[PDB]
Amino acid sequence: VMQLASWDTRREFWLQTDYYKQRMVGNSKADAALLDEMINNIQFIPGDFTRA
Amino acid sequence: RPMLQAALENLQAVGPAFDLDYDQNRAMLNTLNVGPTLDPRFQTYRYLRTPE
């Protein structure tokens, strides 16, 4: 569970996927803005055992 | 009379009697006299989100 919600884990995953590599335009500043948007596309919601 | 004199001589040249618990403490005390080994520059944390 700790690795799932980690900001670091989401960053390393996108850098090695072909989905992200074909979307790089070649400008250093633009790629960083694009990458930060992808990190927020994954959301983790913790559960509660009281409500099952 | 004679062997009674012998008893005094034998116990005189032996000394006090020690049990097992005395010997264990002396062996442990030898390690404590060596002293601890101090190595600095060891980490006290780990990263879940590296600064960027």
From Swiss-Prot, chain A:
Observed phenotype of the null mutant: Null mutation abolishes ECA(CYC) synthesis.
Compartment(s): Cell inner membrane
Domain of life, per lineage: Bacteria
Summary of the function given for this chain in its UniProt record: Modulates the polysaccharide chain length of enterobacterial common antigen (ECA). Required for the assembly of the phosphoglyceride-linked form of ECA (ECA(PG)) and the water-soluble cyclic form of ECA (ECA(CYC)).
Subunit structure: Probably part of a complex composed of WzxE, WzyE and WzzE.
Family statement drawn from the similarity comment of this UniProt entry: Belongs to the WzzB/Cld/Rol family.
Protein name per UniProt: ECA polysaccharide chain length modulation protein
Organism: Escherichia coli (strain K12)
Gene: wzzE
Curated annotation (Swiss-Prot), chain B:
Cleaved signal peptide residues: none
Phenotype caused by lack of the gene: Null mutation abolishes ECA(CYC) synthesis.
Subcellular location, record wording: Cell inner membrane
Family named by the database record: Belongs to the WzzB/Cld/Rol family.
Protein's job: Modulates the polysaccharide chain length of enterobacterial common antigen (ECA). Required for the assembly of the phosphoglyceride-linked form of ECA (ECA(PG)) and the water-soluble cyclic form of ECA (ECA(CYC)).
Self-association and partners: Probably part of a complex composed of WzxE, WzyE and WzzE.
Record-given protein name: ECA polysaccharide chain length modulation protein
Species of provenance: Escherichia coli (strain K12)
Full-protein positions shown: 261 to 312 of 348
